């Protein structure tokens, strides 16, 4: 019998790092803001496929971020690590979400982020220096794209960069984990590490956010010890994994559009605009749109019922032709305003301006010091991560003009 169904499987995997998976360009094109899909466990779910609708549902208080709910749309087995663990505030709803988030925000304001610019410039050129000096060829992942945000986020959290090999490895295993067993074991490695850091900080008040949370909120019983572990773990992995994939994918992508890059290299006033457009275009975290309805919601004559799962896929909504003229075209000159790569509403990405700062420093730095950077394999040979985790390559060999 024909095989066509009205709720395709979800998610799909990318095949060119900067293009929607075929199955996603479909859903984008169907009229209507909501489409049915089938998740890995045969349950059926709603995906939002339009910009204004995504924007409205992300602001709607009837869509919960509670991941311990049995109807939360888990997209992979690995997910049931985070489901059964104490929740960071990304899995909380108002009013709990606010009191937890408000403990971390002092370190992420525009004032604090702006003033970090000297220190971020120092880290980047530091790791380039070392990269360049060991000569081509280089894997831009392990030698640059990953170490740079790791170092920055550690100094912010107060995690010692000495232990960098341990937690980078445990973060890798946890984002890319394909089964539940591997994800839990990565989580328990990281949690056990962080629990010892907290005791160490109870003996000697540490620096960073984690030190301040130990010495203050934990000492007064306003946060559970195990909640602290989850919060620090969220910031640590998010601090690392996202900026690094942006760096690698923005590099693959900028090279396959060499006439916009040229113009980037020639007018550094455009860099903050190309950052926005890169964020819109690449949307590395389309999974981070998971919600469950706690009530019936009406959207343009379609009905989400209490208990249904809804995935706001910000990569599709960012390719909404009625907001971005020719949406599948990378245009560093376009106005990429109102994009959803960071989300919207109360869960809007806490670290977005740190992420903008890192990318804008990193790019300038790559254009000053390796203006002849190019890839050391053809793009068709890179292994892409699957659609069940954050978008990116795991390896990126590159080369340049040696001194
Ligand atoms: C670099 C590229 C990044 C992308 C594409 C990205 C994407 C996102 C998205 C889409 C959300 C929404 C989650 C939801 O609505 O359920 C989110 C939340 C969050 N992100 Fe980012 N993010 C990035 C960088 C960062 C960085 C550098 C940090 C460092 C701390 C960070 C920390 C967080 C936190 C704490 C939240 C949750 C805020 C809340 O739930 O109130 N992110 N991110
Ligand atoms: C199953 C793969 C992972 C967990 C995933 O797809 O999401 C992670 C992977 C790395 C990038 C991410 C970016 C956006 C969000 C912060 C997202 C939410 C997941 C979060 O729940 C991870 C837990 O480790 C945090 C905790 O439970 O303390 C997070």
Q: Which residues of 190-207 are buried (b: 16+ CB within 10 A; e: fewer)?
A: bbebbeebbeebeeeebe
Positions of chain breaks in the chain, given as the residue before each break (C to N > 2.5 Å) = none
Q: Is the CB of 304 under 6 A from ligand 1?
A: no
CA 361 – CA 148 distance, rounded (Å): 11
101 annotated ligand-binding residue: yes
CATH of residue 229's domain is 1.10.630.10
Q: 178: which 2 tokens? A: 């394909």
Whether 117 contacts 357, CB under 8 Å: yes
How far apart are alpha carbons 276 and 28 in whole angstroms? 21
Total count of domains within the chain: 1
Rounded Cα gap, residues 183 and 94, in angstroms: 28
d(CA 278, CA 26): 22
Q: How close is the Cα of 188 to the center of ligand 1, in Å? A: 22
The total of other beta-carbon atoms located within 10 Å of residue 296's CB is 12
Beta carbons within 10 angstroms of residue 42's beta carbon: 7
Burial 237-273 (b: 16+ CB within 10 A, else e): bbbbbbbbbbbbbbbbbbeebeebbeebbeeeebbeb
Nearest one of 214, 170, 211 to 193, comparing CA atoms: 170
Q: How far apart are CA 144 and CA 131, in angstroms?
A: 7
Phi, psi for 63 (deg, rounded to 5): -100, 115
Which residue from 120, 176, 178, 181 is spatially nearest to 395, judged by alpha carbons?
176
Could you tell me if the CB of 79 is within 6 A of ligand 2?
yes
Q: Which two tokens stand for residue 42?
A: 């045969």
Mutate which of 175, 224, 241, 283 to test ligand 2's pocket (most atoms within 8 Å of Cβ)?
175
Range of the domain at 294: 2-401
Does the N-terminal peptide bond of residue 354 adopt cis geometry, omega within 30 degrees of 0? Answer: no
- Return d(Cα 46, Cα 292) in angstroms, integer: 10
Measured from the CB, is residue 318 less than 6 Å from ligand 1?
A: no
Q: What determination technique applies here?
A: X-ray
């Amino acid at each position: 019998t024909p095989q066509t169904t009205d709720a395709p499987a979800f998610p799909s995997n990318r095949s060119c790092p900067y293009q929607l998976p075929d199955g996603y360009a479909q859903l984008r094109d169907t009229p209507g803001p909501l489409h049915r899909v089938t998740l890995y466990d045969g349950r059926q779910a709603w995906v939002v496929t339009k910009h204004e609708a995504a924007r409205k549902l992300l602001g709607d208080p009837r869509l919960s971020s509670n991941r311990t709910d049995d109807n939360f749309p888990a997209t992979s087995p690995a997910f049931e690590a985070v489901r059964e663990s104490p929740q960071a505030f990304i899995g909380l709803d108002p009013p709990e979400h606010g009191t937890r988030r408000r403990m971390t925000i002092s370190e992420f304001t525009v004032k604090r982020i702006k003033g970090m610019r000297p220190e971020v410039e120092e880290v980047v050129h530091g790791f380039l220096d070392e990269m360049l000096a060991a000569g081509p060829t280089a894997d831009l992942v392990s030698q640059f794209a990953l170490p740079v945000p790791s170092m920055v986020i550690c100094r912010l959290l107060g995690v010692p960069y000495a232990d960098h090999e341990f937690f980078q490895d445990a973060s890798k295993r946890l984002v890319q984990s394909t089964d539940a067993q591997s994800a839990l074991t990565a989580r328990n490695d990281l949690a056990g590490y962080l629990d010892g850091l907290i005791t160490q900080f109870q003996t000697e008040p540490g620096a960073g956010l984690v030190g301040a949370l130990v010495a203050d909120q934990l000492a007064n019983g306003e946060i559970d010890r195990e909640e602290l572990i989850s919060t620090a773990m969220l910031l640590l992995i998010a601090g690392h994994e996202t900026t690094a994939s942006m760096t690698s994918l923005s590099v693959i992508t900028l090279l396959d559009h060499p006439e916009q890059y040229a113009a980037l290299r020639a007018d550094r006033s455009l860099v903050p605009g190309a950052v926005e457009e890169l964020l819109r275009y690449l949307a590395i975290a389309d999974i981070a749109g998971g919600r469950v309805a706690t009530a019936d919601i009406e959207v343009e004559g379609q009905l989400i019922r209490a208990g249904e799962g809804v995935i706001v896929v910000n990569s599709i909504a960012n390719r909404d032709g009625t907001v971005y003229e020719d949406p599948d075209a990378l245009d560093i000159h376009r106005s990429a305003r109102h994009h959803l790569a960071f989300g919207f509403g109360v869960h809007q990405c806490l670290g977005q301006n740190l992420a903008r700062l890192e990318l804008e420093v990193i790019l300038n730095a790559l254009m000053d010091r390796v203006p002849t950077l190019r890839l050391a394999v053809p793009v068709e040979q890179l292994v892409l991560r699957p659609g069940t985790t954050i978008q990116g390559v795991n390896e990126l060999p590159v080369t340049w003009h040696h001194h």
